[PDB]
Design a protein around this ligand. Structure first.
Ligand SMILES: CC[C@H](C)C(=O)O[C@H]1C[C@@H](C)C=C2C=C[C@H](C)[C@H](CC[C@H]3C[C@@H](O)CC(=O)N3Cc3ccc4c(CO)c(OC)ccc4c3)[C@H]21
Ligand SMILES: [Mg+2]
Length: 182
């Protein structure tokens, strides 16, 4: 079916350059895998503030993950997840930017820390939300549970916790096994 998917990725100061690049490579792999489907993509970096790295219209003209993500600069600031989700819901899912009104709305959030802001995400309730929490800031189950509020229910489907950035390759292998394009 028609899916408008947005990647919302953390550019916080905690990320080393190879870790940040692993996030970027995961996004490129997913998009490569789903080229030729009727998925459309956008990507937003968040840290303290928010930047649309590419929107749906951009993806439809270029259709090239390497080109679309070539000029990403790592922000290196905080983790304002509440505001970032609201940015996606109000600034990214818009017909003017290539969003399709018939499409299922999916958001994938990739983060390595707890949120530094406060808010609510009512404006994003019609969006299916996955969150991928990576690394040492999610060793404890308290910290993992802070992510449940951002994800769709049940957290058992929509919250993924990865202990290292190397495990993003494993997560992609699971996607390759479960999604089947004919
Ligand atoms: C599928 C198994 C992998 C491990 C996974 O969870 O993928 C998630 C998380 C992350 C690793 C990467 C992803 C990359 C792309 C997909 C969006 C994928 C989830 C796909 C699908 C898995 C399903 O079990 C739960 C769900 O809500 N969706 C999203 C989705 C996709 C299409 C939908 C369509 C059109 O086919 C609908 O129209 C009938 C309705 C809902 C849809 C939901 C998502
Ligand atoms: Mg961080």
């Amino acid at each position: 079916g028609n899916v408008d998917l947005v990647f919302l990725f953390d550019g916080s100061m905690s990320l080393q350059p190879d870790e940040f690049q692993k996030i970027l490579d995961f996004m490129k792999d997913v998009m490569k895998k789903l080229s030729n489907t009727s998925y459309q993509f956008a990507a937003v970096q968040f840290s303290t503030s928010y930047k649309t790295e590419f929107d749906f219209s951009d993806y439809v003209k270029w259709k090239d993950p390497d080109a679309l993500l070539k000029h990403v600069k790592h922000m290196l600031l905080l983790t304002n997840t509440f505001g970032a989700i609201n940015y996606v819901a109000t600034e990214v899912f818009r017909e003017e930017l290539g969003a399709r009104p018939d499409a299922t709305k999916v958001l994938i959030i990739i983060t390595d820390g707890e949120a530094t802001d406060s808010g609510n995400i009512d404006a994003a309730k019609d969006i299916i939300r996955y969150i991928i929490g990576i690394g040492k800031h999610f060793q404890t189950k308290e910290s993992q549970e802070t992510l449940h509020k951002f994800a769709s229910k049940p957290a058992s489907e929509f919250v993924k916790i990865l202990d290292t950035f190397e495990k993003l390759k494993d997560l992609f292998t699971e996607l390759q096994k479960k999604i089947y394009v004919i």
